[PDB]
Amino acid sequence: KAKVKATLGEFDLRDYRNVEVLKRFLSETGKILPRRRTGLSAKEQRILAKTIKRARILGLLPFTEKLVRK
Amino acid sequence: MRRYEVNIVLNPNLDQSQLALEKEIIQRALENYGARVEKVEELGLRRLAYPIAKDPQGYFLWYQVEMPEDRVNDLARELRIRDNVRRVMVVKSQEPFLANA
Amino acid sequence: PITKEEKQKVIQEFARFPGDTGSTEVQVALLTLRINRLSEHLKVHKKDHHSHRGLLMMVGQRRRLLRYLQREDPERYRALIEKLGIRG
Amino acid sequence: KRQVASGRAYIHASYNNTIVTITDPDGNPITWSSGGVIGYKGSRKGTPYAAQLAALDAAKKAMAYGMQSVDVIVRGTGAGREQAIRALQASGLQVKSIVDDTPVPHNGCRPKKKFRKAS
RNA sequence: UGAAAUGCGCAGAUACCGGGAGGAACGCCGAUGGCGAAGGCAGCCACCUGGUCCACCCGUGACGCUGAGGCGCGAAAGCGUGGGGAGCAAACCGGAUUAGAUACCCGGGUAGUCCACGCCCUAAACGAUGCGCGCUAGGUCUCUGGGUCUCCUGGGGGCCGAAGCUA
Numbered sequence: 001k002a003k004v005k006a007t008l009g010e011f012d013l014r015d016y017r018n019v020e021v022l023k024r025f026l027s028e029t030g031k032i033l034p035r036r037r038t039g040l041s042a043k044e045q046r047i048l049a050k051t052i053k054r055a056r057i058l059g060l061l062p063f064t065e066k067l068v069r070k
Numbered sequence: 071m072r073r074y075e076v077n078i079v080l081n082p083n084l085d086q087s088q089l090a091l092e093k094e095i096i097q098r099a100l101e102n103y104g105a106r107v108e109k110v111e112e113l114g115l116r117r118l119a120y121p122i123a124k125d126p127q128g129y130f131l132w133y134q135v136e137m138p139e140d141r142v143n144d145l146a147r148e149l150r151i152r153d154n155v156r157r158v159m160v161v162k163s164q165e166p167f168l169a170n171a
Numbered sequence: 172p173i174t175k176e177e178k179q180k181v182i183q184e185f186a187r188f189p190g191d192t193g194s195t196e197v198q199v200a201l202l203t204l205r206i207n208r209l210s211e212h213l214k215v216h217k218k219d220h221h222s223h224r225g226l227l228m229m230v231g232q233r234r235r236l237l238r239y240l241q242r243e244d245p246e247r248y249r250a251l252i253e254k255l256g257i258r259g
Numbered sequence: 260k261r262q263v264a265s266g267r268a269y270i271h272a273s274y275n276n277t278i279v280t281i282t283d284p285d286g287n288p289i290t291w292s293s294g295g296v297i298g299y300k301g302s303r304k305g306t307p308y309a310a311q312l313a314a315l316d317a318a319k320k321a322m323a324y325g326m327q328s329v330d331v332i333v334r335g336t337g338a339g340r341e342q343a344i345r346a347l348q349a350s351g352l353q354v355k356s357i358v359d360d361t362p363v364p365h366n367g368c369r370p371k372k373k374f375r376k377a378s
Numbered sequence: 379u380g381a382a383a384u385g386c387g388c389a390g391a392u393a394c395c396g397g398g399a400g401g402a403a404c405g406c407c408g409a410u411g412g413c414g415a416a417g418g419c420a421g422c423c424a425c426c427u428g429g430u431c432c433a434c435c436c437g438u439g440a441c442g443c444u445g446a447g448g449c450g451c452g453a454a455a456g457c458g459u460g461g462g463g464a465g466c467a468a469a470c471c472g473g474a475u476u477a478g479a480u481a482c483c484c485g486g487g488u489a490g491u492c493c494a495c496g497c498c499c500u501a502a503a504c505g506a507u508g509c510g511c512g513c514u515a516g517g518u519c520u521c522u523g524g525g526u527c528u529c530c531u532g533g534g535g536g537c538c539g540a541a542g543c544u545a
């Protein structure tokens with residue numbers, strides 16, 4: 001569909017507290033989205049996943065969700 | 071000293087009595103390990119993505135700090151002895167990598 | 172680690188003249204520094220075999236430099252190794 | 260027995276059987292059925308038709324407790340699955356939501372030989 | 379499970395919710411990707427630590443390459459001592475299948491798989507390709523530096539291919 005990167009302005013993707021931003025990079029099942037979807041550079045996507053994994057331990061982001069209407 | 075970032079998550083059902091007592095048991099430990107405290111933040115209450123310690127929310131501290139590296143694990147050990155202290159995550163500071171200019 | 176104040180101090184402390192950053196005497200000096208940090212680290216971390224290779228390379232490269240020196244200037248050789256305490 | 264007007268339908272599709280269990284909205288089971296509880300035994304419990312009948316049986320037993328609507332929650336892939344769902348929907352019993360909640364390791368325990376195959 | 383049976387279940391199993399213990403492994407990210415000399419390395423954090431790339435062209439002044447032997451590393455399985463043991467599982471105990479079935483399938487299950495220390499030193503340890511250096515068209519995709527950032531210039535991973543080589 002349309003890339004998640006393209007729907008945002010600047011943002012520090014080292015920022016493991018900005019759950020508002022971070023959360024659009026997760027799927028409806030709280031799974032880290034692949035680059036095909038996130039629209040990221042390899043290097044960026046590496047840094048992302050790292051800080052997504054931080055948010056998660058902080059309690060700020062989900063490790064999982066359940067799929068609604070299936 | 072390296073520059074670090076100390077996230078603490080607290081029990082969301084506290085009152086000035088303990089909350090403020092915790093916050094200084096913290097200051098004592100931070101100080102007692104050599105932690106100068108630059109910036110500090112406190113968004114405080116917030117909705118967790120999954121329950122921590124049976125409870126659906128958490129109270130969020132965040133401290134920027136400079137301090138001696140040979141102790142930073144020791145400090146972290148001390149912080150979580152406490153019971154209303156639920157998550158401690160000490161993290162090296164980092165230049166903000168940004169995206170989309 | 173080895174911070175550049177620590178390191179600069181070791182370059183001054185040797186260095187034939189002001190500005191000598193390369194050269195046998197300095198190079199051996201720096202290597203001797205790291206070898207010692209890294210010998211210290213493995214005294215505890217017996218299992219850290221990967222690091223231990225690093226050591227072998229450093230050691231050989233140092234031994235290689237000193238071979239060179241002792242051949243060119245047998246004096247400032249005896250001076251260097253005495254000043255650092257080694258290779259006996 | 261008690262009157263509960265809505266609660267959960269928990270479908271457990273597996274390649275060997277669908278088992279449908281119905282509960283109050285706190286998760287305590289009211290009734291339950293399976294391919295075995297219907298006539299079937301052995302390989303036939305696996306069928307989608309077995310699924311329909313169990314879904315329907317367990318929905319009937321549940322309307323005996325005056326059940327009106329359910330939150331559906333599916334787990335496992337299995338022949339009977341969308342069939343078990345389609346049953347509930349068309350059973351009188353009203354289906355508020357449907358939710359896949361199939362449990363999955365964040366790779367953890369070694370599988371049995373049969374389920375390693377992806378090795 | 380092809381179909382079954384052994385097996386577990388009215389000492390109440392299965393499915394469902396709540397609490398607790400433990401062991402082991404880290405899903406998405408994840409790649410045609412990265413790192414390491416090889417073996418090999420994957421949740422997150424901190425400390426300790428090895429390698430390596432680019433820019434400046436500042437320093438030393440051939441200090442280089444290779445390397446019998448030596449020394450060290452060396453997947454799995456295996457061994458010793460002591461822990462640990464959730465799941466999996468040689469052997470083994472059963473159920474099927476079969477003409478038979480010391481197997482393939484199902485149900486159990488010990489060593490082991492896990493940790494520490496000490497052994498073992500093997501492999502389709504494979505790129506089945508010794509290390510180092512110079513030289514000889516390009517095109518295309520990718521990881522990672524620098525620039526005057528359309529394009530240029532390093533380092534690394536692929537694909538097609540000049541000259542040439544090859545049974």
Ligand SMILES: NC[C@@H]1O[C@H](O[C@H]2[C@@H](O)[C@H](O[C@@H]3[C@@H](O)[C@H](N)C[C@H](N)[C@H]3O[C@H]3O[C@H](CO)[C@@H](O)[C@H](O)[C@H]3N)O[C@@H]2CO)[C@H](N)[C@@H](O)[C@@H]1O
Binds near residue numbers: 402403493
């Ligand atoms: N995950 C921990 C790390 O693993 C390494 O080794 C340690 C651990 O992995 C290893 O296992 C620990 C053990 O500490 C402890 N006594 C029992 C505990 N169950 C184990 O836990 C750990 O290993 C197992 C392996 O799956 C799992 O629990 C989990 O992956 C991990 N938490 O034992 C080692 C020390 O007891 C490194 N030594 C170190 O970086 C750190 O302990």
Ligand SMILES: [Mg+2]
Binds near residue numbers: 276304
């Ligand atoms: Mg069956």
Ligand SMILES: [Mg+2]
């Ligand atoms: Mg439970």
Ligand SMILES: [Mg+2]
């Ligand atoms: Mg390999």
Ligand SMILES: [Mg+2]
Binds near residue numbers: 435
């Ligand atoms: Mg020069």
Ligand SMILES: [Mg+2]
């Ligand atoms: Mg000169």
Ligand SMILES: [Mg+2]
């Ligand atoms: Mg070995």
Ligand SMILES: [Mg+2]
């Ligand atoms: Mg082994």
Ligand SMILES: [Mg+2]
């Ligand atoms: Mg043993």
Ligand SMILES: [Mg+2]
């Ligand atoms: Mg048998």
Ligand SMILES: [Mg+2]
């Ligand atoms: Mg078996």
Ligand SMILES: [Mg+2]
């Ligand atoms: Mg078993």
Ligand SMILES: [Mg+2]
Binds near residue numbers: 505
């Ligand atoms: Mg090749």
Ligand SMILES: [Mg+2]
């Ligand atoms: Mg190239």
